[PDB]
Design a protein around this ligand. Structure first.
Ligand SMILES: [K+]
Ligand SMILES: [K+]
Ligand SMILES: [K+]
Ligand SMILES: [K+]
Ligand SMILES: [K+]
Ligand SMILES: [K+]
Ligand SMILES: [K+]
Ligand SMILES: [K+]
Ligand SMILES: [K+]
Ligand SMILES: [K+]
Ligand SMILES: [Mg+2]
Ligand SMILES: [Mg+2]
Ligand SMILES: [Mg+2]
Ligand SMILES: [Mg+2]
Ligand SMILES: [Mg+2]
Ligand SMILES: [Mg+2]
Ligand SMILES: [Mg+2]
Ligand SMILES: [Mg+2]
Ligand SMILES: [Mg+2]
Ligand SMILES: [Mg+2]
Ligand SMILES: [Mg+2]
Ligand SMILES: [Mg+2]
Ligand SMILES: [Mg+2]
Ligand SMILES: [Mg+2]
Ligand SMILES: [Mg+2]
Ligand SMILES: [Mg+2]
Ligand SMILES: [Mg+2]
Ligand SMILES: [Mg+2]
Ligand SMILES: [Mg+2]
Ligand SMILES: [Mg+2]
Ligand SMILES: [Mg+2]
Ligand SMILES: [Mg+2]
Ligand SMILES: [Mg+2]
Ligand SMILES: [Mg+2]
Ligand SMILES: [Mg+2]
Lengths: 55, 117, 251, 230
RNA sequence: UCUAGUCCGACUUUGUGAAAUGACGUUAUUUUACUUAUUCCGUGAAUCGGAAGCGGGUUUUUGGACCCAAGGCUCGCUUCGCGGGCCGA
RNA sequence: UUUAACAGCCUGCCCACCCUGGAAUCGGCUCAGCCGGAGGUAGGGUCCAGCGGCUGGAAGAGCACCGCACGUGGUGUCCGGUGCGCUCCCGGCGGCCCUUGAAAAUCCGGAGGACCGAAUGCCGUCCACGCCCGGUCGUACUCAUAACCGCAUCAG
RNA sequence: GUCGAUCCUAAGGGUCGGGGGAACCCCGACAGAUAGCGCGUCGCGCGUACUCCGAAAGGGAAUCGGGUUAAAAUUCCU
């Protein structure tokens, strides 16, 4: 009954990233995690450059 | 170089058959022609009522004939168009076809031409 | 006589293992470059029950080393594992409960489970609930390690064999009494056709060496030699001793 | 253009997926490929008896080209050439001559020439399978005092005589116009095979371990050598 | 009176070495070395071996994501667009 | 004393979810639980179920009744209540396990964005409407103190 | 076309190759150059040895009233 020919498009989709697969809360958690984890990698990268030049 | 650790049989050329002689000298004759398909109309009292009530002709047909071939056989034989064909296999092992003509044709008129009425 | 019960099991038939609802074999990843040299991070997604197996199992997802896809694995769950936990497998993985390390990198006295016998066999020792192996010592010259198995036996294994840090979860299962034939019925319903057991002395001579007699009794020593042929080898097989294990015997 | 930038990839364990690499040495080859490669390895692992080891000592590349160049000058006639002369003779017969000088081929025919002492040079292929067909030829040539050489390629010999392969070739006599260079070739060939035949009868071949085994063995003896000076 | 199985020895599969000891250049016994026979384990056969560079004396607070190369150099080019080569690896 | 599939609109159960707001004198809440600074109560929303409501289908049908002829006409098919009731379906919660209670076809959604149009006429389009097509075999009947088995029209 | 079979897979069954076997037969994807698929228009990419049988109670595209026979209908008529 979900077949495209038998169901209108608006009833089988959610207008959001990962719509219909992840809830709104789950999408929010992933976005924050992706941003914060990526920021922490930048801090690690910079932190080791200050110690690398120590010589 | 190879980027896959699994060896796959390479594609090789394949030719089509070009026999030096035909296995059969000539094609077989058609064993399911229009006359073979349509054996004879059914003239039972139950069958006759369908000629006028439903504009339907009841035929006994070859058991190997399908609805598509029955439709073409009736067109070639009696030069009439069919609305739909219903078929069944009778308890005696023969096949019966209920052939309903389109409104443009009258089954009673065609039945008289056949010679059952 | 006829074929005794013990002999009929080898043919399979109604004595095959009941495995319809089992989740699959529980084993380590296949040994690869990442685990041999560095470490690979995995994440526990769920801790599941495997019918017929007391120990819970853990589903772990890994990033494939060279393919763009996920790599699913099924591990025997160690006590303390939880969903969302990061699991590290490899030579340089830290010594923490749940991580899988080669025995070479595990110090003496550590508690490990699912220990490999051959490098890359993916785990054969200490897999039951509440069981574990203890690393005894290392032999750098031979490249081997000594571990104490659950039965109390000491075994030599190559230092490359992998092992998970910690003990198998679900321990203490056998302490609880069953109290009922029905509970035993449900236990073995999902294992194999081995229950209930009829005593040999309750049978007729035709189908068991212990059968027959106007009284229920064995009539000959129940200790049978190692080389006895099938159908004759019933009772206490190659028993070095019998009777209550008192003193140093029960050590 | 400032819009272009470098997007480096950090590889390593747990890093960016490595690009396509050559995994040729790890390919799981078909059965046929695996067997022929193991066959080559097994031959050099086992000790090769001298009678079979003498076939590894083939003629030098530099001298081989000179020898093969001379053979090309004595090729047997082709099928078309053979027919073309038989019609020139039929017409000649209707209208009311020199012995050819060509290479002799065929193991059965060559062995007869060697036994009759009419052969002046025998060329033997090193890759005859089964090897028993020619493993005895060097001994026969040595006993008959006929110079012989072992060259690489039965297919190369076969190409001279317009055949897919040839186990050995023979020269009963060369044309007088080039008997000087041919004589020099015999001296070099006779000094490399016939003169060394006696000393090669005790040279066992093979016994060569794999590269990993050799490296592992060389490391062990360094420890012994390093402990000898102290 | 026999028998499947099973245990045990010899020969065979079955080769390459060394040492100790013993017998008459051969030769038995014992221990040990080699790897290609043979046997076993693993995988969708995915970084094995050696030697260099580099570092000193490549990924770990998080239940995310990660593929088909950016870039540099260099030829052909039916040119500012296509097709190759070598680095990146 | 009736109202089918199907189509549209409305409704929005029990849950889940969102916004505002910031709680001890703790409050909310079920038959039972239980929930709250990891954001309760409260106020206002979103979504989900339907074998729910209205209309179309559809009274032109069916049924009942009264006639006329021996097909045909008329009238009615209306308004409420009740439940530890029965059958089936669904919802949500709880108990139980050394028991945790199939697979695949198929279908839907998502991440990624190679590649692609137009200078506005082409390109793209899971939208509406229109057009065409629909194989083969089974289909009667008994299902049992007489159609099955028991030698039978058998108290099994 | 709309109810089923047909399709899917379950316990399992039947098999290639290989390994056994005087042979009838035994094991059954375990000794192996899989089946092919996708996208362009014959080329590229992918590719882990079964496109098999196995359910009229498991999974599963779509039909509803009204009428009609001596005997059929969610199949005939509207
Ligand atoms: K018996
Ligand atoms: K039982
Ligand atoms: K018992
Ligand atoms: K007894
Ligand atoms: K319906
Ligand atoms: K019927
Ligand atoms: K009966
Ligand atoms: K079915
Ligand atoms: K089911
Ligand atoms: K109808
Ligand atoms: Mg039909
Ligand atoms: Mg008991
Ligand atoms: Mg009894
Ligand atoms: Mg007995
Ligand atoms: Mg060794
Ligand atoms: Mg193997
Ligand atoms: Mg609220
Ligand atoms: Mg209405
Ligand atoms: Mg009415
Ligand atoms: Mg019921
Ligand atoms: Mg997208
Ligand atoms: Mg019926
Ligand atoms: Mg009846
Ligand atoms: Mg009944
Ligand atoms: Mg009978
Ligand atoms: Mg159906
Ligand atoms: Mg099966
Ligand atoms: Mg069979
Ligand atoms: Mg076969
Ligand atoms: Mg396989
Ligand atoms: Mg293959
Ligand atoms: Mg199929
Ligand atoms: Mg099937
Ligand atoms: Mg069904
Ligand atoms: Mg009926």
């Amino acid at each position: 009954e979900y077949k495209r020919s038998r169901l209108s498009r608006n009833r089988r989709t959610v207008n959001r990233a990962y719509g219909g697969v992840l809830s709104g809360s789950a999408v929010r958690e992933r976005i924050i995690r992706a941003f914060l984890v990526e920021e922490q990698k930048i801090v690690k990268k910079v932190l080791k450059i200050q110690k690398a030049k120590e010589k | 170089i190879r980027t896959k650790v699994t060896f796959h049989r390479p594609k090789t050329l394949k030719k089509d058959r070009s026999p030096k002689y035909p296995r059969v000298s000539a094609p077989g004759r058609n064993r399911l022609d229009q006359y073979a398909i349509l054996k004879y109309p059914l003239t039972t009292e139950s069958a006759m009522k369908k000629i006028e009530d439903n504009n339907t002709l009841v035929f006994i047909v070859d058991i190997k004939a399908d609805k598509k071939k029955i439709k073409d056989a009736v067109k070639k034989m009696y030069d009439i168009q069919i609305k739909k064909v219903n078929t069944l296999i009778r308890p005696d092992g023969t096949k019966k076809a209920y052939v309903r003509l389109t409104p443009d044709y009258d089954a009673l008129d065609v039945a008289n031409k056949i010679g059952i009425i | 006589g006829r074929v005794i019960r013990a002999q009929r099991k080898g043919a399979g038939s109604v004595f095959k293992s009941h495995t319809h609802h089992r989740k699959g074999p529980a084993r380590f990843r296949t040994l690869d470059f990442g685990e041999r040299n560095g470490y690979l991070k995995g994440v526990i997604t769920e801790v599941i029950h495997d019918p017929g197996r007391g120990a819970p199992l853990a589903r772990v997802t890994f990033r494939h080393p060279f393919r763009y896809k996920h790599q699913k694995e099924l591990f025997v769950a160690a006590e303390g594992m939880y969903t969302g936990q990061f699991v590290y497998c490899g030579k340089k993985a830290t010594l923490m409960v749940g991580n899988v390390l080669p025995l070479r990198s595990i110090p003496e006295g550590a508690v490990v489970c699912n220990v490999e016998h051959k490098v890359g066999d993916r785990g054969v020792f200490a897999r039951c609930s509440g069981d574990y192996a203890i690393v005894i010592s290392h032999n750098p010259d031979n490249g081997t390690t000594r571990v104490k198995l659950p039965s109390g036996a000491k075994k030599i294994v190559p230092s490359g064999c992998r092992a998970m840090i910690g003990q198998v979860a679900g321990g203490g299962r056998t302490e609880k009494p069953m109290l009922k034939a029905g509970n035993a019925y449900h236990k073995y319903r999902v294992k194999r056709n081995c229950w209930p057991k009829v005593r040999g002395v309750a049978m007729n001579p035709v189908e068991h060496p212990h059968g027959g007699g106007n009284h229920q009794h064995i009539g000959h020593a129940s200790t049978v030699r190692r080389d006895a042929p099938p159908g004759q080898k019933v009772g206490l097989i190659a028993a070095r001793r019998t009777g209550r294990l008192r003193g140093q015997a029960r050590a | 253009n400032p819009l272009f930038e470098k997007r480096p990839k950090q590889f390593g364990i747990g890093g960016a997926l490595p690009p396509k690499k050559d995994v040729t040495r790890n390919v799981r080859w078909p059965r046929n490929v695996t067997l022929q490669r193991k066959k080559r390895i097994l031959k050099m692992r086992l000790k090769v008896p001298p009678a079979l080891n003498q076939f590894t000592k083939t003629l030098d590349k530099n001298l081989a080209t000179t020898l093969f160049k001379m053979l090309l000058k004595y090729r047997p006639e082709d099928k078309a050439a053979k027919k073309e002369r038989l019609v020139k003779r039929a017409q000649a017969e209707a209208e009311g001559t020199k012995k050819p000088i060509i290479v002799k081929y065929g193991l059965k025919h060559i062995t007869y020439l060697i036994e009759q002492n009419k052969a002046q040079l025998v060329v033997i292929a090193h890759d005859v399978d089964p090897i028993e067909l020619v493993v005895w030829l060097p001994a026969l040539c040595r006993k008959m005092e006929i110079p012989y050489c072992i060259v690489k390629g039965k297919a190369r010999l076969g190409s001279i005589v317009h055949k897919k392969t040839a186990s050995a070739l023979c020269l009963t006599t060369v044309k007088n116009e080039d008997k000087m260079e041919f004589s020099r070739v015999l001296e070099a060939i006779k000094a490399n095979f016939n003169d060394k035949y006696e000393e090669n009868r005790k040279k066992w071949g093979g016994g060569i371990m794999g590269s990993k085994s050799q490296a592992r063995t060389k490391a062990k003896e360094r420890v012994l050598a390093k402990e000898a000076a102290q």
